[PDB]
Amino acid sequence: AVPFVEDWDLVQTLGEGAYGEVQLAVNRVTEEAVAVKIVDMKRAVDCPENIKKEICINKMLNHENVVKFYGHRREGNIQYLFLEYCSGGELFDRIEPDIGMPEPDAQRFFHQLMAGVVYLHGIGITHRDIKPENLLLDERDNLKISDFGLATVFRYNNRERLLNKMCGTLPYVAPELLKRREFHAEPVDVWSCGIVLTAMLAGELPWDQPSDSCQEYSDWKEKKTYLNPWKKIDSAPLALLHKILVENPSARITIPDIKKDRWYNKPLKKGAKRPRVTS
Numbered sequence: 001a002v003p004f005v006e007d008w009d010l011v012q013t014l015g016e017g018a019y020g021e022v023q024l025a026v027n028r029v030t031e032e033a034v035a036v037k038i039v040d041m042k043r044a045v046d047c048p049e050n051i052k053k054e055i056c057i058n059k060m061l062n063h064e065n066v067v068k069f070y071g072h073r074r075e076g077n078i079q080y081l082f083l084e085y086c087s088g089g090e091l092f093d094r095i096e097p098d099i100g101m102p103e104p105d106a107q108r109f110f111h112q113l114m115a116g117v118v119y120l121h122g123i124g125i126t127h128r129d130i131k132p133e134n135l136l137l138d139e140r141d142n143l144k145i146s147d148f149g150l151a152t153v154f155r156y157n158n159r160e161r162l163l164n165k166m167c168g169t170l171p172y173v174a175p176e177l178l179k180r181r182e183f184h185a186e187p188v189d190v191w192s193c194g195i196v197l198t199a200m201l202a203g204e205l206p207w208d209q210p211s212d213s214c215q216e217y218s219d220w221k222e223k224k225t226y227l228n229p230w231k232k233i234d235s236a237p238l239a240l241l242h243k244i245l246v247e248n249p250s251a252r253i254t255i256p257d258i259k260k261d262r263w264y265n266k267p268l269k270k271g272a273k274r275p276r277v278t279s
């Protein structure tokens with residue numbers, strides 16, 4: 001038993017909002033860095049059950065494109081969740097306003113996003129709030145899906161549950177959440193992935209929300225792709241976006257078909273530069 005190995009110094013606030021905050025923690029002995037999510041359960045009446053569910057869902061997860069859950073500790077009314085530290089920060093901060101990022105970089109992030117979402121959906125979990133703020137990067141820019149506070153089970157014992165809870169973030173949310181009482185979970189996550197791809201390639205969000213009252217959304221359904229953000233996006237990825245951002249969730253492209261898409265499969269991005277010399 002090595003003394004002090006269970007001691008962590010909190011050295012930097014990584015993020016902070018409703019739940020509480022996430023701190024960078026550094027091990028006193030080993031100097032290993034992890035993220036610690038600190039949740040004061042007295043802050044809200046529903047917080048005890050909310051954080052319980054988040055912990056429950058996290059214990060189900062193990063994938064290279066999902067933020068790793070190391071465990072949790074309660075002391076009185078404070079919950080401490082130990083999570084993978086992602087030193088590259090949020091994907092949000094790699095999207096340049098009005099520009100986006102190089103298309104090969106966006107393609108790589110999108111491959112990894114799909115890997116993460118396929119995994120989650122495979123074990124019957126929907127995230128329900130996919131957006132660049134909730135996609136973190138490690139030291140090699142590998143993407144990790146973050147924050148399972150709004151996540152839920154949509155498939156259990158091989159039987160699908162239809163959802164009805166209005167949740168997410170309006171510019172990322174699928175139109176069926178605003179129009180229908182019930183909806184399938186998976187196309188909702190597919191839609192938000194499409195808005196994420198749009199942001200990565202154009203540095204802007206296409207609409208405030210996907211309703212006919214929103215002129216920008218109306219323009220998209222009328223195929224006015226000579227307007228922004230769409231005019232900034234090359235034809236191959238735009239063709240994929242035309243298949244994802246389809247109003248009818250039943251006609252919307254599925255992830256197995258996204259994986260067969262021409263742009264998805266285009267060679268664009270070189271592997272990370274590795275040390276070399278010449279003679």
Ligand SMILES: Cc1cc2n[nH]c(=O)n2c2ccccc12
Binds near residue numbers: 086087089
């Ligand atoms: C910036 C950042 C790094 C991180 N690594 N692991 C995590 O949970 N986070 C975060 C969680 C919330 C907000 C920011 C972060």
